[PDB]
C-alpha cells in the first residue's frame, strides 16, 4: 500500500506526524494485517501549484491509492483540478500563516463535475459565532481587528447579518510589523482622531492568529490606547489552553475568547484508544509536553491516515479491493481510473472516530460536526485574573450557555436559616403550636420573610427570643433577648 | 486544463503567453510560467461584471514573477476614500453583489478607521424580494427605521 | 477586457518590432511539461524583459 503525501518544506511537523501515524498503523495488530503502509519522500514549496501537481503526478506514476497534502489554497485547487482528471481521491489539510483564522479557499472550481477533494475540516461557521456573540452583547457599535494574513470573506456573512441587525461596526488591518503600524498611526492620527480611535476601541473584536493577538494586545498595553474601561472579544479555531491563558495574562479589561472544540471522549484516559487501536501517547495525551505543542494540522493528518487505512479496510470488507493504479499527467493519452472514484466514494462514505472526533463528509465533502467553545475572564477579589467557560456554540442551536450571567452568585436556595423573632402586633404573632414549640406565625414581618423566601428560595425556622427585650447589655458585656441570640451567633 | 493548454501552446511554440482568465486559473498559469519562464501577459476578468479585485493569490515568493498584469492595480479604495471625505460622511453602509471580491476594500476600511466613522457591510442576495420582505416578519419598527 | 486585449496585441506587435529593430530576433522556442524537458531558459527572461 502506497499513500501519496505532499508537505511544505516549513511544515515538517506534518510529515513527522504522518510518519508517526503510518508507524502506529504498521504496528497495529489487526488493521491491514497483510500490508505495509508506505510513502515516497516529498517536500515542496506549498505556494508552487505547478510543482505540487508535478510531484503528485510523479506519486501517481509510482502509484498511490490516495493523495494527502498540506499546501496552499492555489496548490490545493490545482491538485483538486488534477484529481478531477485523474479521479484519484484527494484529502486537503488546510493550513494558514501562523494559524490565521481558517476562511475557506474560495476558489471558483468548476461546478460541472463531482469534487474529488475532501475537506477534512468543517465548513465556515466562525461568522455565526461572532454574530451570536454580538447578539448576546447587543453591541450597537464595535471595532474589528484582523491580521494581514486573514481573508475577510469569512466574516463577510457576519457583517452581512450585523447589517441585517442594523448595528454599526469598525474595521482595521493589523500588519506584520505591529510596532511600525501603531507608531505610524500614533504619529499620523490627530489628537481628536486619536480620541475617536481610543474611544472606539472600548468595544472591539480580534480576528487573528494567537501570536499576532498577543503582540497586538501587548502593543495596545504598552501604547496605553485603552484602560480597563473596555470589553473585547477574540475568535479563532486554533487556540490552545496555553495561548488562552497567555491572552488572559496580556489582555486588559474584560476579554472573551472563542475557540474550536472536539466531541472527543471527555474522559482523558479514553482519548488515546479507538476500538483495538492504540495512538501514540505523544499525540493523544493532553498532558504530554509535545501534545500541548501540536499544531492541529497534526491532528487532521493523523486522522486522515487513520481514515484512509479504515477506508481501505472497509473496501476489503466489501471485497471491492483492487490493485494500485499507475497514471500520467498532461499527456493526450491521460485518462482517469474508475477505481479511484470508487476509492473516493469509499472514503467519503467511510468514517472514523479520530483525534478530532467523529469524522465524516457531507454532500459537498465538508465535515459537518463543527463545534466551538467560548471562554471569558471572571475577575474578582477571590481570584484576580479568574477565568471560566461561558458556553458552547453550534449551528443547530446557537450559543449554549450565556455571556451575560455576570458571575457565580451565592444563591441561597436550599439553605435553612434559623430566625429569632419577637412578637408584636401586627409585626409578628404566633398562630399554631405543637409539642411545646411554635409551628406557624403571622404578621407583616412574615409577609416580608415570605417576599424574600419566594425569590431567594431559602427556608426559615422561627423561634421566640427568651425575654423579648431589645434591651441594653449586662454590665459584664453580655447580651440578652433578641440581640444576644445573634451576638453569640446562636440564630442565623 | 488551462495549464495543459498553456503547455500545449509551448509545445506548438510561442514567443509569449497571453491570457484573459479568472484568477483561479491565472495563478496556476503563473506557477507554470515560474518554471517554464515564458512571459505570461495576464488580463483578469470577473463574474457578471462585478468590480475587480487583484488576485492576491498564494503564489510563491521565491521566484521571479514572469506575469505581466495588463490591467492596472486597484485604486478604488482611495477613490472611495476621497469621495467619502469630500462629502464629509460620518455613517455609511457598503452593499456588494454576490460576486464582488471584497478583499480590495481593506485599505479603505483602514483609512476610514482613522476617521472613526460608523460602517456597515451587506451582501445583496439575488432574491431581493424574499430578503427584504422577510423583514416585515423579522424586524421591529425601530429596526426597520434604523435600516 | 476587449480594450486591454486589443492593446495587448498592439503591445506584442510593438515588442516584436522592437526586437527586430534591436537585431535581437530569434526563432520561436518550444517546451513541454511534467517531463525531463522542463528546464530554465535565460532567453525566456530576456524575452520577458
Curated annotation (Swiss-Prot), chain B:
Disulfide bonds: 23-55
Compartment list: Postsynaptic cell membrane
Illness association: Spinocerebellar ataxia, autosomal recessive, 18: A form of spinocerebellar ataxia, a clinically and genetically heterogeneous group of cerebellar disorders. Patients show progressive incoordination of gait and often poor coordination of hands, speech and eye movements, due to degeneration of the cerebellum with variable involvement of the brainstem and spinal cord. SCAR18 features include progressive cerebellar atrophy, delayed psychomotor development, severely impaired gait, ocular movement abnormalities, and intellectual disability.
Oligomeric form and interacting partners: Tetramer; dimer of dimers. Interacts with EML2, MAGI2 (via PDZ domains) and AP4M1. Interacts with BECN1, GOPC, GRID2IP, SHANK1 and SHANK2. Interacts with CBLN2, but not with CBLN4. Interacts with CBLN1 (via C1q domain); the interaction is CBLN1-NRX1 complex formation-dependent; CBLN1-binding is calcium-independent; CBLN1 hexamers anchor GRID2 N-terminal domain dimers to monomeric NRXN1 isoform beta; promotes synaptogenesis and mediates the D-Serine-dependent long term depression signals and AMPA receptor endocytosis.
Function recorded in the entry: Member of the ionotropic glutamate receptor family, which plays a crucial role in synaptic organization and signal transduction in the central nervous system. Although it shares structural features with ionotropic glutamate receptors, does not bind glutamate as a primary ligand. Promotes synaptogenesis and mediates the D-Serine-dependent long term depression signals and AMPA receptor endocytosis of cerebellar parallel fiber-Purkinje cell (PF-PC) synapses through the NRX1B-CBLN1-GRID2 triad complex.
UniProt record similarity statement: Belongs to the glutamate-gated ion channel (TC 1.A.10.1) family. GRID2 subfamily.
Swiss-Prot/TrEMBL domain comment: The PDZ-binding motif mediates interaction with GOPC.
Protein name: Glutamate receptor ionotropic, delta-2
Source species of the chain: Homo sapiens (Human)
Protein's gene: GRID2
Stretch of the intact protein here: 77 to 223 of 1007
Amino acid at each position: 500500500i502506497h499513500i501519496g503525501a505532499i508537505f511544505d518544506e516549513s511544515a515538517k511537523k506534518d510529515d513527522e506526524v504522518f510518519r508517526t501515524a503510518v508507524g502506529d498503523l504498521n504496528q497495529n495488530e489487526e488493521i491491514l494485517q497483510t500490508e505495509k503502509i508506505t510513502f515516497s519522500v516529498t517536500f515542496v514549496d506549498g505556494n508552487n501549484p505547478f510543482q505540487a501537481v508535478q510531484e503528485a503526478c510523479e506519486l501517481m506514476n509510482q502509484g498511490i491509492l490516495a493523495l494527502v497534502s498540506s499546501i496552499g489554497c492555489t496548490s490545493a485547487g490545482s491538485l483538486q483540478s488534477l484529481a478531477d482528471a485523474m479521479h484519484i481521491p484527494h484529502l486537503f489539510i488546510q493550513r494558514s500563516t501562523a494559524g490565521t483564522p481558517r476562511s475557506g479557499c474560495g476558489l471558483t472550481r468548476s461546478n460541472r463535475n463531482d469534487d474529488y477533494t475532501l475537506s477534512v475540516r468543517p465548513p465556515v461557521y466562525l461568522h455565526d459565532v461572532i454574530l451570536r456573540v454580538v447578539t448576546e452583547y447587543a453591541w450597537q457599535k464595535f471595532i474589528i481587528f484582523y491580521d494581514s494574513e486573514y481573508d475577510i470573506r469569512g466574516i463577510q456573512e457576519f457583517l452581512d447579518k450585523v447589517s441585517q441587525q442594523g448595528m454599526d461596526v469598525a474595521l482595521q488591518k493589523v500588519e506584520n510589523n505591529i510596532n511600525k503600524m501603531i507608531t505610524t498611526l500614533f504619529d499620523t492620527m490627530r489628537i481628536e482622531e486619536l480620541n475617536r480611535y481610543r474611544d472606539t476601541l472600548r468595544r472591539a473584536i480580534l480576528v487573528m492568529n494567537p501570536a499576532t493577538a498577543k503582540s497586538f494586545i501587548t502593543e495596545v498595553v504598552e501604547t496605553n490606547l485603552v484602560a480597563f474601561d473596555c470589553h473585547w472579544i477574540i475568535i479563532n479555531e486554533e487556540i490552545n489552553d496555553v495561548d488562552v491563558q497567555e491572552l488572559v495574562r496580556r489582555s486588559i479589561g474584560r476579554l472573551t475568547i472563542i475557540r474550536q472544540t472536539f466531541p472527543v471522549p471527555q474522559n482523558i484516559s479514553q482519548r488515546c484508544f479507538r476500538g483495538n487501536h492504540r495512538i501514540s501517547s505523544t499525540l493523544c495525551d493532553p498532558k504530554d509536553p509535545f501534545a500541548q505543542n501540536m499544531e492541529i494540522s497534526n491532528l487532521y493528518i493523523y486522522d486522515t491516515v487513520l481514515l484512509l487505512a479504515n477506508a481501505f479496510h472497509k473496501k476489503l470488507e466489501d471485497r471491492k479491493w483492487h490493485s494500485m493504479a499507475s497514471l500520467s499527467c498532461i499527456r493526450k493519452n491521460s485518462k482517469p481510473w474508475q477505481g479511484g472514484r470508487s476509492m473516493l466514494e469509499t472514503i467519503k462514505k467511510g468514517g472514523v472516530s479520530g483525534l478530532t472526533g467523529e469524522l465524516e463528509f457531507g454532500e459537498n465533502g465538508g465535515n459537518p460536526n463543527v463545534h466551538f467553545e467560548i471562554l471569558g475572564t471572571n475577575y474578582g477579589e477571590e481570584l484576580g485574573r479568574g477565568v471560566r467557560k461561558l458556553g458552547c456554540w453550534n449551528p443547530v442551536t446557537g450559543l449554549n450557555g450565556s455571556l451575560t450571567d455576570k458571575k457565580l452568585e451565592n444563591n441561597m436556595r436550599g439553605v435553612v436559616l434559623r430566625v429569632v423573632t419577637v412578637l408584636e402586633e401586627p409585626f409578628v404573632m404566633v398562630s399554631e403550636n405543637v409539642l411545646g414549640k411554635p409551628k406557624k406565625y403571622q404578621g407583616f414581618s412574615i409577609d416580608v420573610l415570605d417576599a424574600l423566601s419566594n425569590y431567594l428560595g431559602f427556608n426559615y425556622e422561627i423561634y421566640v427570643a427568651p425575654d423579648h427585650k431589645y434591651g441594653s447589655p449586662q454590665e459584664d458585656g453580655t447580651w440578652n433577648g433578641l440581640v444576644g441570640e445573634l451576638v453569640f451567633k446562636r440564630a442565623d
